[PDB]
DNA sequence: AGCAATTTAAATAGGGAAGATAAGCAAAGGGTTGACGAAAGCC
C-alpha cells in the first residue's frame, strides 16, 4: 500500500530529507533534501512528529519499505507512476 | 715510587624418547537520561 503510506505520511506530517541535525541535537528539527546525490545506493531518510505512521500489514513502515530494493529511486524516477512522483516530490 | 713482553691455537660427531590426561557447577541486575503536541488554568 505504498500510495497509501504516503498520503499518510504527508498528513501526520511527512519530512523526507537526506540531510538533517536530528542526528547531532534531537531539538533540532531542521531537515533539508539534497537533489544532486541521490543515487542507486542512496538510503533516504523520513521524519514525522513522534516518528508515527501505519506499516503495510507485514510489520513494516513506511522508511523500511522506502530503503529497500531501491524503492525511493524507483518512485523518484517515475517507475511507480507520476502520482507517486509528484506525491514523493512535494 | 714506575717498570709486568710478544705469536699460536682453543675438537671434530652422535643423541636429544613417547603415552595418558587438561572437570563438571552457577551466577553475568535494573534503576535516569521524552520532544512534540495538545488540554487547560493564567497573565
Given at each position: 500500500?505504498?500510495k497509501?503510506m504516503?498520503?499518510?505520511?504527508?498528513?501526520?506530517?511527512?519530512?523526507?530529507?537526506?540531510?538533517?541535525?536530528?542526528?547531532?541535537?534531537?531539538?533540532?528539527?531542521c531537515?533539508?533534501f539534497?537533489?544532486?546525490?541521490?543515487?542507486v545506493?542512496?538510503?533516504?531518510d523520513?521524519?514525522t512528529?513522534?516518528?508515527?505512521?501505519?506499516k503495510?500489514?507485514?510489520?513494516?513502515?513506511?522508511?523500511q519499505?522506502?530503503?529497500?530494493?531501491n524503492?525511493?529511486y524507483?518512485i523518484?524516477?517515475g517507475?511507480?507512476?507520476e502520482?507517486?512522483?509528484?506525491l514523493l516530490k512535494?
Amino acid at each position: 500500500m505504498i500510495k497509501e503510506m504516503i498520503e499518510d505520511f504527508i498528513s501526520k506530517g511527512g519530512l523526507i530529507f537526506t540531510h538533517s541535525g536530528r542526528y547531532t541535537n534531537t531539538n533540532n528539527s531542521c531537515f533539508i533534501f539534497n537533489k544532486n546525490d541521490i543515487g542507486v545506493d542512496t538510503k533516504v531518510d523520513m521524519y514525522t512528529p513522534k516518528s508515527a505512521g501505519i506499516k503495510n500489514e507485514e510489520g513494516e513502515n513506511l522508511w523500511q519499505v522506502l530503503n529497500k530494493a531501491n524503492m525511493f529511486y524507483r518512485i523518484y524516477s517515475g517507475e511507480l507512476g507520476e502520482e507517486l512522483q509528484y506525491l514523493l516530490k512535494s
